[PDB]
Assembly symmetry: C2
Homo-oligomer: 103 residues x 2
Protein backbone atom coordinates (compact mmCIF):
# COMPACT_ATOMS: atom_id res chain seq x y z
CA UNK A 1 0.00 0.00 0.00
CA UNK A 2 2.62 2.41 1.16
CA UNK A 3 5.20 -0.24 2.10
CA UNK A 4 5.93 -3.53 0.36
CA UNK A 5 7.31 -6.57 2.13
CA UNK A 6 10.18 -8.77 1.07
CA UNK A 7 9.34 -11.35 -1.60
CA UNK A 8 8.28 -14.62 0.02
CA UNK A 9 8.80 -17.19 -2.76
CA UNK A 10 11.89 -18.78 -4.31
CA UNK A 11 14.05 -17.20 -7.02
CA UNK A 12 15.81 -19.15 -9.75
CA UNK A 13 19.06 -18.60 -11.65
CA UNK A 14 18.56 -17.65 -15.29
CA UNK A 15 22.32 -17.49 -15.98
CA UNK A 16 25.53 -17.97 -14.06
CA UNK A 17 26.67 -14.79 -12.29
CA UNK A 18 29.09 -12.92 -14.55
CA UNK A 19 32.03 -10.58 -13.87
CA UNK A 20 31.52 -7.06 -15.25
CA UNK A 21 35.19 -6.06 -15.49
CA UNK A 22 34.44 -3.26 -13.00
CA UNK A 23 35.07 -5.25 -9.78
CA UNK A 24 31.31 -6.09 -9.79
CA UNK A 25 29.11 -9.08 -10.71
CA UNK A 26 25.78 -9.14 -12.60
CA UNK A 27 23.15 -11.78 -11.93
CA UNK A 28 20.04 -12.47 -14.01
CA UNK A 29 17.21 -14.23 -12.14
CA UNK A 30 13.54 -15.12 -12.39
CA UNK A 31 11.03 -14.79 -9.52
CA UNK A 32 8.73 -17.82 -9.17
CA UNK A 33 6.12 -15.93 -7.14
CA UNK A 34 3.17 -13.78 -8.07
CA UNK A 35 3.06 -11.73 -4.82
CA UNK A 36 4.80 -8.77 -6.49
CA UNK A 37 5.48 -5.93 -6.09
CA UNK A 38 7.91 -6.97 -3.39
CA UNK A 39 11.48 -6.28 -2.30
CA UNK A 40 14.18 -8.75 -3.37
CA UNK A 41 16.06 -10.40 -0.45
CA UNK A 42 19.57 -10.41 -2.00
CA UNK A 43 23.02 -9.84 -0.44
CA UNK A 44 26.67 -10.92 -0.46
CA UNK A 45 27.86 -12.56 2.77
CA UNK A 46 31.13 -13.95 4.12
CA UNK A 47 29.71 -17.40 4.89
CA UNK A 48 26.42 -19.24 5.19
CA UNK A 49 26.67 -19.03 9.01
CA UNK A 50 27.19 -15.23 9.16
CA UNK A 51 24.69 -13.53 6.85
CA UNK A 52 25.91 -9.96 7.58
CA UNK A 53 25.74 -8.14 4.21
CA UNK A 54 29.29 -7.21 3.21
CA UNK A 55 28.80 -6.59 -0.51
CA UNK A 56 27.97 -3.11 -1.75
CA UNK A 57 24.71 -3.15 -3.71
CA UNK A 58 25.18 -1.45 -7.08
CA UNK A 59 21.52 -2.07 -7.96
CA UNK A 60 20.47 -1.04 -4.46
CA UNK A 61 17.04 -1.89 -3.01
CA UNK A 62 15.80 -3.80 -6.08
CA UNK A 63 12.15 -4.82 -6.47
CA UNK A 64 10.08 -7.36 -8.30
CA UNK A 65 7.55 -5.13 -10.04
CA UNK A 66 5.38 -7.73 -11.81
CA UNK A 67 2.42 -9.69 -10.43
CA UNK A 68 2.98 -12.44 -13.02
CA UNK A 69 4.93 -15.56 -12.13
CA UNK A 70 8.52 -16.05 -13.35
CA UNK A 71 9.30 -12.45 -14.29
CA UNK A 72 12.92 -11.56 -15.06
CA UNK A 73 15.09 -9.58 -12.63
CA UNK A 74 18.67 -8.17 -12.84
CA UNK A 75 20.95 -7.24 -9.90
CA UNK A 76 24.58 -6.02 -9.78
CA UNK A 77 26.78 -6.21 -6.69
CA UNK A 78 30.36 -5.63 -5.49
CA UNK A 79 31.80 -8.75 -3.82
CA UNK A 80 34.80 -8.44 -1.52
CA UNK A 81 38.08 -9.72 -2.85
CA UNK A 82 38.50 -13.36 -2.00
CA UNK A 83 35.69 -15.75 -1.09
CA UNK A 84 32.02 -14.91 -0.51
CA UNK A 85 28.50 -16.23 -1.17
CA UNK A 86 25.76 -14.58 -3.22
CA UNK A 87 22.50 -15.32 -1.39
CA UNK A 88 18.91 -14.77 -2.63
CA UNK A 89 15.88 -15.54 -0.48
CA UNK A 90 15.75 -16.79 3.07
CA UNK A 91 15.35 -20.00 5.00
CA UNK A 92 14.35 -22.98 2.90
CA UNK A 93 13.72 -20.69 -0.09
CA UNK A 94 17.40 -19.66 -0.13
CA UNK A 95 19.59 -20.08 -3.20
CA UNK A 96 23.31 -19.51 -2.93
CA UNK A 97 26.23 -19.16 -5.33
CA UNK A 98 29.77 -19.32 -3.97
CA UNK A 99 31.97 -16.60 -5.50
CA UNK A 100 35.73 -15.97 -5.65
CA UNK A 101 37.02 -12.54 -6.73
CA UNK A 102 40.61 -11.99 -7.85
CA UNK A 103 42.77 -9.41 -9.62
Amino acid sequence: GTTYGMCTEKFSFAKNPADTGHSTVVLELQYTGSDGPCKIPISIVASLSDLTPIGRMVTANPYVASSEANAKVLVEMEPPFGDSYIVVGRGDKQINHHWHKAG
Copy 2:
Protein backbone atom coordinates in the same frame (compact mmCIF):
# COMPACT_ATOMS: atom_id res chain seq x y z
CA THR B 1 29.88 -8.22 -20.74
CA THR B 2 28.22 -4.85 -20.20
CA TYR B 3 24.69 -3.63 -20.88
CA GLY B 4 24.07 -0.17 -22.30
CA MET B 5 21.48 2.48 -21.52
CA CYS B 6 17.88 1.95 -22.63
CA THR B 7 17.31 3.96 -25.80
CA GLU B 8 13.52 3.85 -26.13
CA LYS B 9 10.69 5.71 -24.39
CA PHE B 10 9.36 5.00 -20.89
CA SER B 11 6.03 6.05 -19.44
CA PHE B 12 4.85 6.88 -15.94
CA ALA B 13 2.13 4.34 -15.05
CA LYS B 14 0.58 5.94 -11.94
CA ASN B 15 1.38 8.87 -9.68
CA PRO B 16 4.54 8.59 -7.59
CA ALA B 17 3.42 7.49 -4.13
CA ASP B 18 4.69 8.58 -0.70
CA THR B 19 5.73 5.44 1.21
CA GLY B 20 5.39 7.19 4.57
CA HIS B 21 9.06 6.80 5.45
CA SER B 22 10.35 9.84 3.53
CA THR B 23 10.59 8.13 0.14
CA VAL B 24 8.50 7.88 -3.01
CA VAL B 25 7.78 4.83 -5.22
CA LEU B 26 7.18 5.16 -8.98
CA GLU B 27 5.93 2.45 -11.34
CA LEU B 28 7.13 2.68 -14.96
CA GLN B 29 6.65 0.61 -18.10
CA TYR B 30 9.33 0.37 -20.81
CA THR B 31 8.34 0.59 -24.47
CA GLY B 32 11.57 -0.88 -25.88
CA SER B 33 12.76 -4.40 -26.65
CA ASP B 34 16.50 -3.70 -26.39
CA GLY B 35 16.58 -5.05 -22.83
CA PRO B 36 18.43 -5.83 -20.70
CA CYS B 37 19.49 -2.19 -20.48
CA LYS B 38 20.22 0.49 -17.87
CA ILE B 39 17.39 2.90 -17.02
CA PRO B 40 18.22 6.59 -17.57
CA ILE B 41 16.54 8.01 -14.45
CA SER B 42 17.48 10.77 -12.01
CA ILE B 43 16.00 13.52 -9.82
CA VAL B 44 16.82 17.08 -10.91
CA ALA B 45 16.25 20.57 -9.52
CA SER B 46 14.85 21.91 -12.80
CA LEU B 47 14.62 20.82 -16.43
CA SER B 48 17.33 23.38 -17.34
CA ASP B 49 19.87 21.93 -14.84
CA LEU B 50 19.95 18.14 -15.05
CA THR B 51 22.52 17.71 -12.25
CA PRO B 52 21.40 14.65 -10.23
CA ILE B 53 20.27 15.59 -6.72
CA GLY B 54 18.26 13.92 -3.96
CA ARG B 55 18.87 10.20 -3.72
CA MET B 56 17.92 7.18 -5.81
CA VAL B 57 16.92 4.49 -3.29
CA THR B 58 16.57 1.95 -6.11
CA ALA B 59 19.94 2.91 -7.54
CA ASN B 60 21.11 1.95 -11.04
CA PRO B 61 17.94 0.03 -11.98
CA TYR B 62 17.85 -2.10 -15.14
CA VAL B 63 15.15 -3.32 -17.45
CA ALA B 64 15.73 -7.07 -17.21
CA SER B 65 13.36 -8.40 -19.89
CA SER B 66 13.61 -8.40 -23.68
CA GLU B 67 9.87 -8.03 -24.33
CA ALA B 68 8.12 -4.70 -24.78
CA ASN B 69 5.96 -3.13 -22.03
CA ALA B 70 7.87 -4.64 -19.08
CA LYS B 71 7.09 -3.20 -15.62
CA VAL B 72 9.70 -1.57 -13.36
CA LEU B 73 9.45 -0.13 -9.84
CA VAL B 74 11.81 2.59 -8.59
CA GLU B 75 12.08 4.19 -5.13
CA MET B 76 13.47 7.70 -4.61
CA GLU B 77 14.15 10.34 -1.95
CA PRO B 78 13.42 13.69 -3.61
CA PRO B 79 14.63 16.88 -1.94
CA PHE B 80 12.32 19.24 -0.08
CA GLY B 81 10.67 21.76 -2.39
CA ASP B 82 10.34 21.35 -6.19
CA SER B 83 12.09 18.63 -8.18
CA TYR B 84 11.53 16.64 -11.39
CA ILE B 85 11.80 12.88 -11.88
CA VAL B 86 13.36 12.58 -15.35
CA VAL B 87 13.41 9.36 -17.42
CA GLY B 88 15.02 9.37 -20.86
CA ARG B 89 16.68 12.08 -22.91
CA GLY B 90 16.02 14.38 -25.84
CA ASP B 91 12.97 13.35 -27.82
CA LYS B 92 12.14 10.42 -25.52
CA GLN B 93 12.44 12.35 -22.24
CA ILE B 94 9.49 12.17 -19.85
CA ASN B 95 9.38 14.00 -16.55
CA HIS B 96 7.20 14.21 -13.45
CA HIS B 97 7.15 17.30 -11.27
CA TRP B 98 7.15 16.68 -7.51
CA HIS B 99 6.78 19.02 -4.53
CA LYS B 100 7.83 17.76 -1.08
CA ALA B 101 6.78 19.65 2.04
CA GLY B 102 6.34 19.39 5.78
